[PDB]
Scaffold this active site. Structure first.
Site, PDB file in Angstrom:
ATOM      1  N   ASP A   1      -3.603  -0.745   5.502  1.00 16.74           N
ATOM      2  CA  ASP A   1      -3.080  -2.069   4.810  1.00 16.74           C
ATOM      3  C   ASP A   1      -4.037  -2.352   5.570  1.00 16.74           C
ATOM      4  OD1 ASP A   1      -2.682  -4.720   4.325  1.00 16.74           O
ATOM      5  OD2 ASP A   1      -0.568  -3.894   3.879  1.00 16.74           O
TER       6      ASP A   1
ATOM      7  N   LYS B   1       5.288 -15.746   9.391  1.00 24.52           N
ATOM      8  CA  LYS B   1       5.544 -14.278   9.358  1.00 24.52           C
ATOM      9  C   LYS B   1       5.430 -13.935  10.448  1.00 24.52           C
ATOM     10  CE  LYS B   1       4.809 -10.187   6.569  1.00 24.52           C
ATOM     11  NZ  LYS B   1       3.996  -9.529   5.947  1.00 24.52           N
TER      12      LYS B   1
ATOM     13  N   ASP C   1       5.499  -9.917  -2.749  1.00 25.03           N
ATOM     14  CA  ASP C   1       4.984 -10.193  -1.552  1.00 25.03           C
ATOM     15  C   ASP C   1       4.729 -11.060  -0.494  1.00 25.03           C
ATOM     16  OD1 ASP C   1       3.697  -9.495   1.009  1.00 25.03           O
ATOM     17  OD2 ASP C   1       1.364  -8.292  -0.654  1.00 25.03           O
TER      18      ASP C   1
ATOM     19  N   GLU D   1       6.568  -2.286   3.335  1.00 26.75           N
ATOM     20  CA  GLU D   1       5.508  -3.025   2.614  1.00 26.75           C
ATOM     21  C   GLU D   1       4.144  -1.251   2.076  1.00 26.75           C
ATOM     22  OE1 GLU D   1       3.052  -5.901   4.961  1.00 26.75           O
ATOM     23  OE2 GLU D   1       4.651  -7.145   4.030  1.00 26.75           O
TER      24      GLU D   1
END
Ligand SMILES: OC[C@H]1C[C@@H](Nc2ncnc3cccc(OCc4ccccc4)c23)[C@H](O)[C@@H]1O
Lengths: 115, 378
Positions: free
Chosen positions: B196, B68, B7, B172
């Site tokens: 999330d 990211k 991840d 994800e």
């Protein structure tokens, strides 16, 4: 709280503080070595440009010393000591004050170089 | 050597492996199950993970994180333009592509986001190899469901630069659903909501699963929302308390604010399993000791707008997926901040007392599901 009621539980907190005191002594030694290096640069034959490079390498090292002392404070800040743990509370206060006095010394170095 | 699940997160990454009929989340060299997505450049070396995050206060300009948020984007992308303001490191424009500029071994150097991400992936690969005592080459790497072709390809490029054979890239929320085995439930189409809240981002995704085909129906969220904001509200509360009790403002002393902030982050974690937290800080400011406490109820009031605000994205995703809240079969909690009881309470109440999928560590669920998929592809 009662008189002469030292407890085994307090011994555990005092051992944590002693380990922190030893880590502070090691960091302090690093500060004294940085102080000696600074004097050496000042009393050396480095010309202006190389003197600046050497003081900025010394700066990164003084910033590392400050950070180590800050991590010690953050570690001491995790402690919760009951009001009855008088000896641990005294030791914690003295250690924080000692670290803060070393931080003030770091600041005198850090602000006097690599400006 | 087996295949791993990785991840790759904005602020933290996680690697897992499926062995002996169970998923093992792998601890790094410092014993941490998650590793900071940080890369630091210094005069003498390049540091990755905990080593990079641990010197951030010393070398802020040369320590990179949040790659990211830049990976696969053009320089003029609104996200790149807005996010730059919050970073202490330089972001430059190399013919329409962003690059991070740093001082490395006494020289001005620049790196593409996939290069910074490849260094983090190298660390995750090494972490797996150190635990297994075997070479690791194959991996399943996750990405946000809203990532476009450019962003997905750039993530795959980061894997390739790191020496990994990127078997598959999966979303994800798909990984999170897989960890709970929601694709294995018999019946009609299943509508899954993935909540999330971790690593500084908030992502809500609605997926419909039928005969093992994951369909992303909608995505919503907040690009910048997380634990740091909740800690900040506790810091404000304490700074105000210190002013009331001692008539002193500790706000301009960076070290005092830091000691307070570090204690607040810790107290917030205690408040997820206890109703009260105590803090003792000697000589916080001007020699004054600060001994105080905070209840879970007060923490919840300080963060009332932010906690309630998490339902707006849920409502938006439901409207975009053309679904009523009663049509959601499963709810999955992902990210470390979903451990906050008030956030769980708000989400369960919005879904009329429906039980949440939260048994898997929230910080580890995406790596867990990616590790399961990496085992299936072995
Ligand atoms: O950037 C990651 C987030 C997750 C927050 N963690 C937690 N928040 C609330 N309650 C918690 C209760 C237990 C454990 C938690 O997280 C521990 C942790 C710390 C660092 C990375 C991952 C998880 C909690 C953490 O404080 C940070 O703000």
């Amino acid at each position: 709280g009662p008189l002469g009621s030292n407890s085994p539980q307090e011994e555990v907190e005092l051992k944590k503080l002693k380990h922190l005191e030893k880590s502070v002594e090691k960091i302090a030694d690093q500060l004294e070595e940085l102080n000696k290096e600074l004097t050496g640069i000042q009393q050396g034959f480095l010309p202006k440009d190389l003197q600046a490079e050497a003081l900025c390498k010394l700066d990164r090292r003084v910033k590392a010393t400050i950070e180590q002392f800050m991590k010690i404070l953050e570690e001491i800040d995790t402690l919760i000591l009951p009001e009855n743990f008088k000896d641990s509370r005294l030791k914690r206060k003295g250690l924080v004050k000692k670290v803060q006095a070393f931080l003030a010394e770091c600041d005198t170095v850090e602000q006097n170089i690599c400006q | 050597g087996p295949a791993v699940g990785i991840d790759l997160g904005t602020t933290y990454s996680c690697v897992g492996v499926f062995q002996h009929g169970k998923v093992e989340i792998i601890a790094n060299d410092q014993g941490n199950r998650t590793t900071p997505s940080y890369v630091a450049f210094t005069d003498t070396e390049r540091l990755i993970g905990d080593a990079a995050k641990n010197q951030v206060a010393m070398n802020p300009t040369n320590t990179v994180f949040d790659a990211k948020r830049l990976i696969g984007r053009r320089f003029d992308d609104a996200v790149v333009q807005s996010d730059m303001k919050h970073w202490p490191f330089m972001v430059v424009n190399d013919a329409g592509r962003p690059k991070v500029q740093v001082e490395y071994k006494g020289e001005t150097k620049s790196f593409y986001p996939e290069e910074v991400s490849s260094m983090v992936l190298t660390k995750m690969k090494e972490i797996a190899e150190a635990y297994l005592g075997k070479t690791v080459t194959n991996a399943v790497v996750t990405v946000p469901a809203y990532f476009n072709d450019s962003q997905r390809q750039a993530t795959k490029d980061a894997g390739t630069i790191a020496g990994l054979n990127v078997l598959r890239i999966i979303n994800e929320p798909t990984a999170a659903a897989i960890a709970y085995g929601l694709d294995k439930k018999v019946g009609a189409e299943r509508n899954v909501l993935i909540f999330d809240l971790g690593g500084g981002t908030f992502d809500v995704s609605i997926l419909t699963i039928e005969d093992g085909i994951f369909e992303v129906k909608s995505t919503a969220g907040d690009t910048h929302l997380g634990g740091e904001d909740f800690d900040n509200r506790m810091v404000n509360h304490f700074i105000a308390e210190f002013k009331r009790k001692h008539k002193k403002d500790i706000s301009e002393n960076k070290r005092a604010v830091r000691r307070l902030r570090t204690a607040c982050e810790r107290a917030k974690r205690t408040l997820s399993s206890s109703t009260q937290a105590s803090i003792e800080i000697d000589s916080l400011y001007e020699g004054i000791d600060f001994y105080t406490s905070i209840t879970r109820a007060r923490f919840e009031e300080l963060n009332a707008d932010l906690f309630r605000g998490t339902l707006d994205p849920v409502e938006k995703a439901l409207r975009d997926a053309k679904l009523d809240k009663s049509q959601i079969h499963d709810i999955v909690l992902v990210g470390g901040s979903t451990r906050i009881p008030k956030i769980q309470k708000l989400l369960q109440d919005f879904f009329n007392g429906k039980e949440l999928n939260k048994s898997i560590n929230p910080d580890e669920a995406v790596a867990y599901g990616a590790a399961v998929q990496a085992a299936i592809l072995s």
